[PDB]
Design a protein around this nucleic acid. Structure first.
Ligand SMILES: [Mg+2]
Lengths: 95, 87, 96, 106, 96, 82, 106, 95
DNA sequence: ATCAATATCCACCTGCAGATACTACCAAAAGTGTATTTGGAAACTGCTCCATCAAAAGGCATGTTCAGCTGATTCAGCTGAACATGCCTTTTGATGGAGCAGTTTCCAAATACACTTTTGGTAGTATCTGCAGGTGGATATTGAT
DNA sequence: ATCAATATCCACCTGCAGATACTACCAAAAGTGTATTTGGAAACTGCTCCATCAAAAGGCATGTTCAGCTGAATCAGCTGAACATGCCTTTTGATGGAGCAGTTTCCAAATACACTTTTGGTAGTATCTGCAGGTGGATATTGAT
């Protein structure tokens, strides 16, 4: 009866943080789910190619970062970069 | 089962009023009388292309049923990514 | 017997359809069209209903955006009436 | 026992993202920071779109974001519009928009 | 004392430049423009010679095809003279 | 004789480009429009190439940096490697 | 020791094609025939283009294929033109083509 | 010093078979090589996606074939498929 | 019409950039042979959801009428095409040195693995609520006069 | 301007499907803690090929002049919008089974070293040739008359 994963509970968590009294319809959620898978594949793909172009067989935070600057337009890239740099910084210090 | 009924000329189910509506949504005020057949023609080419690719995925998977994912992947290949159906 | 002038109902419909999101082509007819086109590629095919709905959403969004482009080709020709030549110029420039 | 998400200060699931990177065959190896950084980016972007869609719900006197809200949010924002420039949001409709020459009189 | 009609030399040049494949912008002014633009993203940059060439081949290919579409947009409006509005329409329909 | 770089893309050269594109008559405003467009095109591609340059930690933009950036902008070029 | 190419009847290198697939991160594994098929397809499309390009060289009094020929070969053929619809052949120029409304009155 | 690989010799071998008295310029050969690499990447990428869509770990000739059908326009696909099926026949019926 | 200015053609000639051809050579693929592992087709079959069917909900087809848009016609003015007439930029080549690319080292970060804990999904039975659609009545827009 | 036909607004309400809420449950995910491998960073370095600049090459800037295009204004013919009318097809909602999807079995085919052979790439040289870029001379094209 196999299980279908989605980002729903995380999308939902994030929704409560920005708009604590707003719901999301299941159709709207299916879209948010498509959106995250989509940006996922697009970023991971750029990172894949990038690693290959540089004869590097490892995908690091450095590849994801460049992938983000190649994929996202100006301001979104800038903010995404921050959030990712700071998640890593924090991740590394937590051990 | 017994003889599934013949399908012909269904392009004509895309009616003058339904096409006019789509043009409204698209911002269109006035519509020459030849637009309806032109649009039907353009739509058919659009569906042939998408369906061809969808059906190619179905057969590859050795199924008899065209799935939403078959269509979603055919849409992506075609540069017409669709969110909302398992994307 | 009142009569709106030519154009007035047309603008009212633009406003109404631009504000809603429901599909505009009748469902069953669209589905028959999909089945007919599919059958000609391959016999004995079945379809998930959400596969048919996915095609409809895609086909309707493709066609709405094609009319916007078509409209801008007409307006460029200093008309307000879309013609086959507008659609064809849109499709050529789009590289279809 | 800390999740890598809590460790990194994120709502989005870092184990999942690491696993999904492995199964996707993007590279022989996936660095430890990669899913953390990727999960943050993804969390960010969904926050950006939810902020905006949330506003469109509010602007339309509603409390439940539906796909029309997502579409209003995306198409009204220059950058999200570009990132999703080749994407269709089912049940989104279009922005209200009428070319000038089409309006009546002068 | 002899003058060709306006449009005769233009045709002669259309036939000539469609026959040939040489780049049509001088290399150096192109080189400077490239370097000037790259400076806003990184200071102290060198360029492989082939790098700058690749960029010129691509820009010229791009501008030539856009001039085709532009020309189609002028013709659509029943003109034979290309104008900024034709370029603008072409870019809008391409989705640029 | 101080002159802008964009202006080094000259009237006659734009005019040739147009001719290759089948253009017969050209309005005086085209030259400035065209430069605007060329600038946007080079910004978009160069940005991406330079981002590849930086990633590899080089000071030199390579043909491959440009080719790879052309590819992702949907402008695949044949002739310069890859 | 007979190479896989000669086994398959091919001028294009099957072993290389195989190595390029493994090291390409396309999948965990690569079946025995996939390189063979791939290399044939590649040989074939190459032959198809060199065919038409060569013809085009002949028609221009030339015995050496240059970019110009590859361009005329490709853009004069409906299917190759579509395959390469988003591709620029450096130093290819374009097809002679003048819109008819631009012709002088005769 | 590092070996720079290319399909150049294989393209030349095919050239001589199809036009035995025609040669090719370096620049034209460079274009052919881009072409082969490009068609390679498009077909492999499409096969990759296929295998992922169907939760398989292996790219086989079957995937290469569906990839080809998805990618090449009509007649080109047909002849490519028959070329590909043939090469795999010869390969098998051969010790 | 003819006449003459200029462009365009074809044949033939040649010099050298660009291409073929050589060969020692040699590393790193590509093939081979043996040992081990696993992916996915087959056979069985649980169970979702698709095709298909009848009852009313409710848009479509057609003809008539005429408003106003398209497209032809005309025409004057301004705007690009052509083509003089000079200079100033670009191209070409030559020569230091920046940096990219090759190579070797070694350790931080990676994969592998086994075993222990947590989590996200689903199922089942639960009651909860946002808004769609209905109403009617208050105001706005439209078009005749 | 006014009047009056009809669309539009929004405010209030009841029904209900779609959302949210809950406990019991578990498989597979994720975390944790070892043992073992290695990708790529660092550091040093030899050699392209890049930026520079000076000498030779040559195209573009400018102004005058006017052909012929663009766009305005005018008009009629006729297309396409609006709307009344009649009525047929799609929408929706409830059962029977085709096929999809979840088991488990198991071998044909995959990967994984290790080991032997070859080929494709480079470098040094030398060797060769297709054709671009002149030339003369014959005719075609264009534009004046
Ligand atoms: Mg049929």
């Amino acid at each position: 009866k196999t299980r279908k994963e989605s980002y729903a509970i995380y999308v939902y968590k994030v929704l409560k943080q920005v708009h604590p009294d707003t719901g999301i319809s299941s159709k709207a959620m299916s879209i948010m789910n498509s959106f995250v898978n989509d940006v996922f594949e697009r970023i991971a793909g750029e990172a894949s190619r990038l690693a290959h172009y540089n004869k590097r067989s490892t995908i690091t935070s450095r590849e994801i970062q460049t992938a983000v600057r190649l994929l996202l337009p100006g301001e979104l890239a800038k903010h995404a970069v921050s959030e990712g740099t700071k998640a890593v910084t924090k991740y590394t210090s937590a051990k | 089962k017994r003889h599934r009924k013949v399908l012909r000329d269904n392009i004509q189910g895309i009616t003058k009023p339904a096409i006019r509506r789509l043009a409204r949504r698209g911002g269109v005020k006035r519509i020459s009388g030849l637009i309806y057949e032109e649009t039907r023609g353009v739509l058919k080419v659009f569906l042939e292309n998408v369906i061809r690719d969808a059906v190619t995925y179905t057969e590859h998977a050795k199924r008899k049923t065209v799935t939403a994912m078959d269509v979603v992947y055919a849409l992506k290949r075609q540069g017409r990514t669709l969110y909302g159906f398992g994307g | 017997p009142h009569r709106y002038r030519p154009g007035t109902v047309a603008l009212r419909e633009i406003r109404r359809y631009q504000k809603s999101t429901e599909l505009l082509i009748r469902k069953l007819p669209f589905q028959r069209l999909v089945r007919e086109i599919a059958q000609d590629f391959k016999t004995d095919l079945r379809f998930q209903s959400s596969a048919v709905m996915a095609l409809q959403e895609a086909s309707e969004a493709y066609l709405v955006a094609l009319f916007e482009d078509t409209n801008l080709c007409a307006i460029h020709a200093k008309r307000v009436t879309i013609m086959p030549k507008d659609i064809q110029l849109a499709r050529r420039i789009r590289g279809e | 026992a800390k999740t890598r998400s809590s460790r990194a200060g994120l709502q989005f699931p870092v184990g999942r993202v690491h696993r999904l990177l492995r199964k996707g065959n993007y590279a022989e190896r996936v660095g430890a920071g990669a899913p953390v950084y990727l999960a943050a980016v993804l969390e960010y972007l969904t926050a950006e779109i939810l902020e905006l869609a949330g506003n469109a719900a509010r602007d339309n006197k509603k409390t439940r974001i539906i796909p029309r809200h997502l579409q209003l949010a995306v198409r009204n924002d220059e950058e999200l519009n570009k990132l999703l420039g080749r994407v269709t949001i089912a049940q989104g409709g279009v922005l209200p928009n009428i070319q000038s020459v089409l309006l009546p009189k002068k």
